[PDB]
From a paper:
2-Oxoglutarate (2OG) and Fe(II)-dependent oxygenases couple substrate oxidation with 2OG decarboxylation to give succinate and CO2; they have important functions in human biology, e.g., in hypoxia signaling, extracellular matrix biosynthesis, lipid metabolism, and DNA/RNA damage repair. The human 2OG oxygenases studied, factor inhibiting hypoxia-inducible transcription factor HIF-α (FIH) and aspartate/asparagine-β-hydroxylase (AspH), catalyze C3 hydroxylations of Asp/Asn-residues. Like AspH, human factor inhibiting the hypoxia-inducible transcription factor HIF-α (FIH) catalyzes the post-translational oxidation of Asp- and Asn-residues in a 2OG-dependent manner, however, to give the β-threo hydroxylated product. FIH was initially identified as catalyzing hydroxylation of an Asn-residue in the C-terminal transactivation domain of HIF-α isoforms (Asn803 in HIF-1α), a reaction that suppresses HIF-mediated transcription.
The nature of the FIH substrate does not seem to influence the conformation of 1, as revealed by co-crystallization with a fragment of the ankyrin repeat-containing validated human FIH substrate tankyrase-262 (FIH:1:TNKS2691–710; 2.01 Å resolution). High levels of FIH substrate hydroxylation were observed for 3-methyl-2OG and 4-methyl-2OG, both of which are natural products, regardless of the substrate, indicating that these 2OG derivatives can efficiently replace 2OG (entries 2 and 13). NMR studies reveal that FIH converts 1 and 12 into 2-methylsuccinate with a similar efficiency to which it converts 2OG into succinate. Notably, 3-methyl-2OG is an efficient cosubstrate for both FIH and AspH (entry 2), whereas its isomer 4-methyl-2OG is apparently more efficient in maintaining FIH compared with AspH activity (entry 13). The FIH Kmapp-value for 4-methyl-2OG is similar to that of 2OG, indicating a similar affinity; by contrast, the FIH Kmapp-value for 1, the 3-methyl regioisomer of 12, is higher. Although the C3/C4-alkyl 2OG derivatives were used as racemic mixtures, the crystallographic analyses reveal that, at least predominantly, the (S)-enantiomers of the 2OG derivatives bind to FIH, potentially owing to their ability to engage in more efficient hydrophobic interactions with the hydrophobic Leu186 and Leu188 sidechains. The observation that the conformations of C3- and C4-alkyl 2OG derivatives are very similar to that of 2OG in complex with FIH is in agreement with their similar Kmapp-values.
Numbering used by the authors:
A (entry chain A): 15 to 349
B (entry chain B): 692 to 708
Write the structure that this text describes.
Amino acid sequence: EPREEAGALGPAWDESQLRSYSFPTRPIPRLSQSDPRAEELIENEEPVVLTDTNLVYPALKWDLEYLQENIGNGDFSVYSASTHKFLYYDEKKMANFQNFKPRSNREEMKFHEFVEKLQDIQQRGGEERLYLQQTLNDTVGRKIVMDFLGFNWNWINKQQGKRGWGQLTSNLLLIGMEGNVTPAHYDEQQNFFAQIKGYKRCILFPPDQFECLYPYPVHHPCDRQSQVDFDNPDYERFPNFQNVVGYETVVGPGDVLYIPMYWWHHIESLLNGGITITVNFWYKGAPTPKRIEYPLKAHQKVAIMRNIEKMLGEALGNPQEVGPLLNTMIKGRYN
Amino acid sequence: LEVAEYLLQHGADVNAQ
Ligand SMILES: C[C@@H](CC(=O)O)C(=O)C(=O)O
Ligand SMILES: [Zn+2]
Protein backbone atom coordinates (compact mmCIF):
# COMPACT_ATOMS: atom_id res chain seq x y z
CA GLU A 1 0.00 0.00 0.00
CA PRO A 2 2.80 2.57 0.57
CA ARG A 3 3.13 4.64 -2.59
CA GLU A 4 6.48 5.13 -4.32
CA GLU A 5 7.46 8.80 -4.48
CA ALA A 6 8.46 10.30 -7.81
CA GLY A 7 12.11 10.65 -8.75
CA ALA A 8 12.84 7.15 -7.42
CA LEU A 9 13.00 8.59 -3.89
CA GLY A 10 11.65 5.32 -2.49
CA PRO A 11 8.64 4.53 -0.31
CA ALA A 12 7.47 7.55 1.65
CA TRP A 13 6.65 5.44 4.71
CA ASP A 14 6.83 1.87 5.99
CA GLU A 15 4.39 -0.43 7.76
CA SER A 16 6.70 -0.49 10.78
CA GLN A 17 5.62 3.11 11.44
CA LEU A 18 2.02 2.00 12.10
CA ARG A 19 0.66 1.17 15.53
CA SER A 20 -0.86 -2.27 16.07
CA TYR A 21 -4.58 -2.71 16.73
CA SER A 22 -7.00 -5.57 17.29
CA PHE A 23 -9.38 -4.99 14.38
CA PRO A 24 -9.18 -5.54 10.60
CA THR A 25 -9.42 -2.79 8.01
CA ARG A 26 -9.81 -2.28 4.29
CA PRO A 27 -8.35 0.63 2.33
CA ILE A 28 -10.08 3.90 1.54
CA PRO A 29 -10.04 4.61 -2.23
CA ARG A 30 -7.36 6.97 -3.54
CA LEU A 31 -8.79 8.75 -6.58
CA SER A 32 -8.41 11.83 -8.73
CA GLN A 33 -10.86 14.66 -8.15
CA SER A 34 -11.84 14.24 -11.82
CA ASP A 35 -12.82 10.59 -11.29
CA PRO A 36 -16.63 10.20 -11.23
CA ARG A 37 -16.27 7.49 -8.58
CA ALA A 38 -14.79 10.13 -6.26
CA GLU A 39 -17.81 12.35 -6.92
CA GLU A 40 -20.08 9.36 -6.25
CA LEU A 41 -18.44 8.61 -2.89
CA ILE A 42 -18.71 12.19 -1.62
CA GLU A 43 -22.34 12.45 -2.73
CA ASN A 44 -23.18 9.22 -0.87
CA GLU A 45 -21.23 10.54 2.15
CA GLU A 46 -18.51 7.89 2.02
CA PRO A 47 -14.81 8.57 2.63
CA VAL A 48 -12.36 9.07 -0.22
CA VAL A 49 -8.79 10.32 -0.56
CA LEU A 50 -8.41 12.91 -3.33
CA THR A 51 -4.84 13.06 -4.60
CA ASP A 52 -4.89 16.09 -6.92
CA THR A 53 -7.21 18.80 -5.59
CA ASN A 54 -4.45 21.39 -5.05
CA LEU A 55 -6.69 22.44 -2.17
CA VAL A 56 -3.82 23.75 -0.03
CA TYR A 57 -1.14 23.90 -2.73
CA PRO A 58 0.38 27.17 -1.38
CA ALA A 59 0.65 25.61 2.10
CA LEU A 60 2.77 22.66 0.96
CA LYS A 61 5.84 24.86 1.45
CA TRP A 62 4.90 25.33 5.12
CA ASP A 63 7.36 24.30 7.81
CA LEU A 64 7.97 25.51 11.35
CA GLU A 65 10.46 28.14 10.14
CA TYR A 66 8.14 29.62 7.51
CA LEU A 67 5.13 29.59 9.84
CA GLN A 68 6.97 31.13 12.79
CA GLU A 69 8.19 33.97 10.57
CA ASN A 70 4.78 34.62 8.97
CA ILE A 71 1.91 33.28 11.11
CA GLY A 72 1.80 36.36 13.34
CA ASN A 73 1.86 36.96 17.08
CA GLY A 74 -1.53 35.56 18.06
CA ASP A 75 -2.24 32.94 20.70
CA PHE A 76 -2.12 29.26 19.73
CA SER A 77 -3.79 26.48 21.69
CA VAL A 78 -1.12 23.84 22.37
CA TYR A 79 -1.99 20.59 24.13
CA SER A 80 0.56 18.86 26.36
CA ALA A 81 0.45 15.21 27.39
CA SER A 82 2.75 12.46 28.64
CA THR A 83 0.87 9.85 26.57
CA HIS A 84 0.66 9.57 22.80
CA LYS A 85 -3.14 9.82 23.11
CA PHE A 86 -4.57 13.34 22.81
CA LEU A 87 -8.16 12.58 23.78
CA TYR A 88 -10.35 15.59 23.07
CA TYR A 89 -12.47 16.94 25.93
CA ASP A 90 -14.94 19.82 26.09
CA GLU A 91 -13.83 22.12 28.90
CA LYS A 92 -17.32 23.62 29.24
CA LYS A 93 -18.65 20.20 30.33
CA MET A 94 -16.04 19.39 33.00
CA ALA A 95 -18.21 21.05 35.67
CA ASN A 96 -20.75 18.21 35.46
CA PHE A 97 -18.05 15.49 35.59
CA GLN A 98 -15.60 16.91 38.13
CA ASN A 99 -14.11 13.45 38.75
CA PHE A 100 -12.80 13.51 35.16
CA LYS A 101 -9.14 14.55 35.02
CA PRO A 102 -7.85 14.89 31.43
CA ARG A 103 -4.46 13.41 30.59
CA SER A 104 -3.68 16.38 28.31
CA ASN A 105 -3.65 20.08 29.20
CA ARG A 106 -4.19 23.14 27.01
CA GLU A 107 -1.68 26.02 27.11
CA GLU A 108 -2.07 29.30 25.23
CA MET A 109 1.21 30.21 23.63
CA LYS A 110 2.88 32.20 20.87
CA PHE A 111 4.08 30.27 17.84
CA HIS A 112 7.77 30.95 18.51
CA GLU A 113 7.33 29.56 22.03
CA PHE A 114 5.77 26.39 20.60
CA VAL A 115 8.80 25.94 18.34
CA GLU A 116 11.06 26.57 21.34
CA LYS A 117 9.17 24.09 23.52
CA LEU A 118 9.40 21.62 20.65
CA GLN A 119 13.15 22.18 20.34
CA ASP A 120 13.83 21.93 24.08
CA ILE A 121 12.03 18.58 24.25
CA GLN A 122 13.99 17.35 21.23
CA GLN A 123 17.24 18.46 22.88
CA ARG A 124 16.71 16.99 26.35
CA GLY A 125 15.28 13.75 24.95
CA GLY A 126 12.17 14.27 27.05
CA GLU A 127 8.97 12.32 26.47
CA GLU A 128 6.48 15.18 26.79
CA ARG A 129 4.29 15.45 23.70
CA LEU A 130 2.76 18.55 22.11
CA TYR A 131 -0.14 18.88 19.67
CA LEU A 132 -0.88 22.37 18.35
CA GLN A 133 -4.55 22.72 17.39
CA GLN A 134 -5.61 26.25 16.45
CA THR A 135 -8.35 27.65 14.24
CA LEU A 136 -6.98 30.06 11.66
CA ASN A 137 -8.05 33.68 12.19
CA ASP A 138 -7.23 37.20 11.01
CA THR A 139 -4.23 37.53 13.35
CA VAL A 140 -2.07 35.67 10.82
CA GLY A 141 0.61 37.50 8.85
CA ARG A 142 0.27 38.75 5.30
CA LYS A 143 2.11 35.85 3.64
CA ILE A 144 -0.19 33.36 5.38
CA VAL A 145 -3.17 35.39 4.18
CA MET A 146 -1.82 35.17 0.63
CA ASP A 147 -1.36 31.41 1.00
CA PHE A 148 -4.87 31.05 2.44
CA LEU A 149 -6.31 33.04 -0.47
CA GLY A 150 -4.39 30.70 -2.78
CA PHE A 151 -6.31 27.61 -1.68
CA ASN A 152 -8.50 25.96 -4.31
CA TRP A 153 -11.69 27.70 -3.25
CA ASN A 154 -13.14 27.12 -6.72
CA TRP A 155 -13.15 23.35 -6.14
CA ILE A 156 -14.28 23.25 -2.51
CA ASN A 157 -16.96 25.94 -2.96
CA LYS A 158 -18.46 23.78 -5.72
CA GLN A 159 -18.39 20.81 -3.34
CA GLN A 160 -20.16 22.86 -0.67
CA GLY A 161 -22.82 23.84 -3.20
CA LYS A 162 -23.27 20.42 -4.80
CA ARG A 163 -23.80 18.75 -1.40
CA GLY A 164 -26.04 21.48 0.03
CA TRP A 165 -23.72 21.90 3.01
CA GLY A 166 -23.93 24.89 5.32
CA GLN A 167 -21.24 27.46 6.00
CA LEU A 168 -17.54 26.83 6.37
CA THR A 169 -17.12 27.21 10.13
CA SER A 170 -13.41 26.67 10.76
CA ASN A 171 -9.98 25.81 9.39
CA LEU A 172 -8.17 23.95 12.18
CA LEU A 173 -4.38 24.12 11.95
CA LEU A 174 -2.88 20.88 13.28
CA ILE A 175 0.84 20.49 14.01
CA GLY A 176 1.68 17.30 15.87
CA MET A 177 4.71 15.30 16.94
CA GLU A 178 5.55 11.92 15.45
CA GLY A 179 3.53 9.20 17.14
CA ASN A 180 0.75 11.55 18.27
CA VAL A 181 -2.73 10.01 18.25
CA THR A 182 -6.19 11.56 18.27
CA PRO A 183 -8.45 8.77 19.62
CA ALA A 184 -11.54 7.68 17.74
CA HIS A 185 -14.43 10.15 17.59
CA TYR A 186 -17.02 11.56 15.21
CA ASP A 187 -17.68 15.20 14.36
CA GLU A 188 -21.01 16.92 13.74
CA GLN A 189 -19.69 18.67 10.61
CA GLN A 190 -18.47 17.71 7.16
CA ASN A 191 -14.68 17.71 6.89
CA PHE A 192 -12.14 18.00 4.08
CA PHE A 193 -8.88 16.93 5.74
CA ALA A 194 -5.94 18.48 3.86
CA GLN A 195 -2.52 17.01 4.63
CA ILE A 196 0.45 19.37 4.29
CA LYS A 197 3.57 17.93 5.97
CA GLY A 198 4.35 14.45 7.19
CA TYR A 199 2.07 11.43 7.06
CA LYS A 200 -1.06 10.54 9.03
CA ARG A 201 -2.74 7.14 9.26
CA CYS A 202 -6.53 7.61 9.28
CA ILE A 203 -8.87 4.80 10.35
CA LEU A 204 -12.56 5.53 9.79
CA PHE A 205 -15.67 3.64 10.90
CA PRO A 206 -19.15 4.22 9.41
CA PRO A 207 -21.95 5.60 11.61
CA ASP A 208 -23.64 2.17 11.81
CA GLN A 209 -20.83 0.94 14.10
CA PHE A 210 -22.13 3.15 16.93
CA GLU A 211 -22.83 -0.03 18.92
CA CYS A 212 -19.18 -1.13 18.67
CA LEU A 213 -17.47 2.14 19.65
CA TYR A 214 -19.36 3.21 22.80
CA PRO A 215 -19.23 7.03 22.82
CA TYR A 216 -19.19 8.77 26.18
CA PRO A 217 -22.48 10.24 27.42
CA VAL A 218 -23.50 13.39 25.59
CA HIS A 219 -23.01 15.50 28.74
CA HIS A 220 -19.52 14.09 29.39
CA PRO A 221 -16.56 16.29 28.36
CA CYS A 222 -15.52 13.52 25.95
CA ASP A 223 -18.88 13.60 24.17
CA ARG A 224 -18.53 12.11 20.65
CA GLN A 225 -15.26 10.34 21.61
CA SER A 226 -15.04 6.57 21.93
CA GLN A 227 -14.66 5.09 25.41
CA VAL A 228 -12.60 2.18 24.05
CA ASP A 229 -8.84 2.27 24.61
CA PHE A 230 -7.68 1.06 21.20
CA ASP A 231 -4.38 0.07 22.83
CA ASN A 232 -6.03 -2.20 25.43
CA PRO A 233 -9.70 -2.84 24.60
CA ASP A 234 -11.84 -3.85 27.58
CA TYR A 235 -14.00 -6.49 25.90
CA GLU A 236 -16.10 -7.03 29.04
CA ARG A 237 -17.31 -3.42 29.08
CA PHE A 238 -17.22 -3.07 25.28
CA PRO A 239 -17.94 -6.54 23.84
CA ASN A 240 -19.04 -5.31 20.41
CA PHE A 241 -15.65 -3.67 19.83
CA GLN A 242 -14.70 -7.22 18.76
CA ASN A 243 -16.87 -6.56 15.68
CA VAL A 244 -15.40 -3.24 14.48
CA VAL A 245 -14.01 -3.01 10.94
CA GLY A 246 -12.23 0.13 9.80
CA TYR A 247 -11.57 2.00 6.57
CA GLU A 248 -7.88 2.85 6.54
CA THR A 249 -5.48 5.09 4.62
CA VAL A 250 -2.25 7.04 5.01
CA VAL A 251 -2.45 10.63 3.75
CA GLY A 252 0.62 12.62 2.79
CA PRO A 253 1.44 16.09 1.47
CA GLY A 254 -1.12 17.06 -1.15
CA ASP A 255 -3.74 14.47 -0.21
CA VAL A 256 -7.23 15.47 0.93
CA LEU A 257 -9.38 13.02 2.90
CA TYR A 258 -13.14 13.51 2.93
CA ILE A 259 -14.25 12.58 6.45
CA PRO A 260 -18.06 12.49 6.16
CA MET A 261 -20.16 13.88 8.98
CA TYR A 262 -20.82 11.33 11.77
CA TRP A 263 -18.07 8.97 10.55
CA TRP A 264 -15.77 7.89 13.36
CA HIS A 265 -12.09 8.48 12.71
CA HIS A 266 -8.87 7.54 14.48
CA ILE A 267 -5.87 9.53 13.26
CA GLU A 268 -2.20 9.13 14.19
CA SER A 269 1.05 10.76 13.12
CA LEU A 270 3.34 8.03 11.83
CA LEU A 271 6.02 6.74 14.17
CA ASN A 272 9.47 8.18 13.41
CA GLY A 273 7.90 10.37 10.71
CA GLY A 274 8.79 13.80 12.09
CA ILE A 275 6.24 16.53 12.64
CA THR A 276 2.93 16.52 10.79
CA ILE A 277 0.95 19.51 9.51
CA THR A 278 -2.72 19.44 8.52
CA VAL A 279 -5.43 22.00 7.82
CA ASN A 280 -9.04 20.80 7.87
CA PHE A 281 -12.17 22.39 6.38
CA TRP A 282 -15.26 22.02 8.60
CA TYR A 283 -18.66 22.64 6.98
CA LYS A 284 -22.08 22.55 8.60
CA GLY A 285 -24.17 19.68 7.32
CA ALA A 286 -27.18 20.10 5.08
CA PRO A 287 -30.52 20.55 6.89
CA THR A 288 -32.92 17.74 7.62
CA PRO A 289 -34.59 16.79 4.32
CA LYS A 290 -38.05 18.09 3.47
CA ARG A 291 -39.58 14.59 3.43
CA ILE A 292 -38.34 11.97 5.90
CA GLU A 293 -37.96 8.50 4.38
CA TYR A 294 -38.06 5.28 6.39
CA PRO A 295 -36.33 3.32 7.67
CA LEU A 296 -33.93 5.97 8.94
CA LYS A 297 -30.21 5.95 8.23
CA ALA A 298 -27.68 5.17 10.95
CA HIS A 299 -26.64 8.82 11.26
CA GLN A 300 -30.27 9.88 11.72
CA LYS A 301 -30.62 7.44 14.62
CA VAL A 302 -27.42 8.91 16.09
CA ALA A 303 -28.99 12.37 15.86
CA ILE A 304 -32.08 11.03 17.65
CA MET A 305 -30.11 9.38 20.45
CA ARG A 306 -28.14 12.58 21.02
CA ASN A 307 -31.35 14.61 21.24
CA ILE A 308 -32.87 12.14 23.71
CA GLU A 309 -29.85 12.50 25.99
CA LYS A 310 -29.94 16.29 25.64
CA MET A 311 -33.65 16.47 26.47
CA LEU A 312 -33.37 14.25 29.54
CA GLY A 313 -30.37 16.16 30.87
CA GLU A 314 -32.46 19.33 30.65
CA ALA A 315 -35.79 17.95 31.89
CA LEU A 316 -34.21 16.18 34.87
CA GLY A 317 -32.24 19.32 35.78
CA ASN A 318 -29.06 17.27 36.21
CA PRO A 319 -27.13 15.35 33.51
CA GLN A 320 -26.01 12.65 35.97
CA GLU A 321 -29.64 11.55 36.43
CA VAL A 322 -29.84 10.67 32.72
CA GLY A 323 -28.33 7.21 33.14
CA PRO A 324 -30.49 6.08 36.06
CA LEU A 325 -33.72 7.06 34.30
CA LEU A 326 -32.65 5.39 31.06
CA ASN A 327 -31.85 2.16 32.92
CA THR A 328 -35.17 2.33 34.77
CA MET A 329 -36.94 2.63 31.41
CA ILE A 330 -35.39 -0.52 29.98
CA LYS A 331 -34.56 -3.05 32.71
CA GLY A 332 -37.10 -5.84 32.34
CA ARG A 333 -39.04 -3.77 29.77
CA TYR A 334 -36.94 -3.50 26.59
CA ASN A 335 -33.90 -5.67 27.38
CA LEU B 1 -44.27 14.69 11.40
CA GLU B 2 -42.90 17.35 13.75
CA VAL B 3 -41.67 15.04 16.52
CA ALA B 4 -39.50 13.30 13.92
CA GLU B 5 -38.20 16.58 12.51
CA TYR B 6 -37.45 17.78 16.05
CA LEU B 7 -35.45 14.69 17.03
CA LEU B 8 -33.58 14.63 13.70
CA GLN B 9 -32.05 18.09 14.23
CA HIS B 10 -28.26 18.08 14.54
CA GLY B 11 -25.75 20.45 16.10
CA ALA B 12 -22.32 21.40 14.79
CA ASP B 13 -20.02 20.19 17.55
CA VAL B 14 -16.43 19.39 16.55
CA ASN B 15 -13.13 18.70 18.34
CA ALA B 16 -12.35 22.39 18.76
CA GLN B 17 -13.13 24.52 21.82
C1 LIG C 1 -8.10 17.03 14.80
C2 LIG C 1 -8.27 15.93 13.76
C3 LIG C 1 -7.42 14.80 14.22
C4 LIG C 1 -5.96 14.86 13.99
O1 LIG C 1 -5.59 15.29 12.79
O2 LIG C 1 -5.18 14.57 14.85
C5 LIG C 1 -9.73 15.67 13.50
O3 LIG C 1 -10.28 14.80 14.15
C6 LIG C 1 -10.42 16.36 12.57
O4 LIG C 1 -9.97 17.21 11.65
O5 LIG C 1 -11.62 16.26 12.51
ZN1 LIG D 1 -12.42 14.78 13.99
